[PDB]
Design a protein around this ligand. Sequence first.
Ligand SMILES: O=C(O)c1ccc(NS(=O)(=O)c2ccc(N3C(=O)c4ccccc4C3=O)cc2)cc1
Ligand SMILES: CCCCCCCCCCCCC/C=C/[C@H](O)[C@H](N)CO
Lengths: 278, 34
Amino acid sequence: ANNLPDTQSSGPAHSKETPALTAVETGATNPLVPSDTVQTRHVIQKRTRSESTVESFFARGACVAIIEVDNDAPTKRASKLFSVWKITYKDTVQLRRKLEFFTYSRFDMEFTFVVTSNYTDANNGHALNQVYQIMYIPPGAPIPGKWNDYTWQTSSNPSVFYTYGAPPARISVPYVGIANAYSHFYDGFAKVPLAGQASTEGDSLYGAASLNDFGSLAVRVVNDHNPTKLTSKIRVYMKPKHVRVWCPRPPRAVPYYGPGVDYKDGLAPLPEKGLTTY
Amino acid sequence: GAQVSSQINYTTINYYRDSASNAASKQSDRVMQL
Ligand SMILES: O=C(O)c1ccc(NS(=O)(=O)c2ccc(N3C(=O)c4ccccc4C3=O)cc2)cc1
Ligand SMILES: CCCCCCCCCCCCC/C=C/[C@H](O)[C@H](N)CO
């Protein structure tokens, strides 16, 4: 967020110093300023880079998931009375691309849950205000098997009970990585296959570290069902905070295809433009 | 007034107002940016 250097007055030049000429082969960028190649006036620079700090770049809540749940009679096998969403930023694209400008990152994370609901039909009465349970299931904790099984006691899991109509729920977590930074890219495997092991052993997905690195969110409607079916969507908004990032990378240029770096479609991003056309 | 000058000397005197009347007095470099 630092200010910018002033432009210094620069007059005619006639000398053996040639800042214009360089050698990009060295791998360095020629740090020229306008006064190196043209005559410049004195300008007291007042612009700053306050809004391009990494913190400012990521200081936005981005939607990373839309978790759909129902409030309906359990006999209705079509309805889904609870939903489990594995935590990740890779279900949407925008925040993913912003994060993947970099190879490593540390940040606290602010989760904000925006809950919307609606009737599905109009001939089965009405509903009282719903309460939603959002339980964090860290890896290894038992995953709910039913909307009302014992796991929802949440004696040790953190849970947020959100009352419909209240302002979106919000919680914060610190940096919870087991490494010293989050790895946006992992060039490796969880397993190394060993010679003599059958083809079904030692095989792991390329670039995946843990089968379950950050656990899940289990969402249900706590209320018992009304005579009419209600559908709800919980939109999850992530905001990195206190961000640090390492090893910048070129941003994604073609559409994402899965959680890896794979690509299948849209491999022609650049449009056509004449070489000598302005 | 009288000018005495080495040649053993010689004497010169200007007799005229105008100077025009006076007698003749015999006394890497390869790399550049612009
Ligand atoms: O309305 C918007 O904000 C919103 C609207 C569209 C949008 N992009 S999308 O490509 O249409 C899209 C649409 C749905 C999902 N999505 C699911 O279908 C889902 C199911 C379960 C868990 C998580 C998710 C999840 O992200 C992901 C992306 C994102 C957010
Ligand atoms: C209701 C409480 C829920 C709390 C959830 C805490 C989980 C925090 C997850 C933060 C997400 C970090 C981003 C992911 C990092 C990289 O992808 C991994 N290192 C590689 O999978």
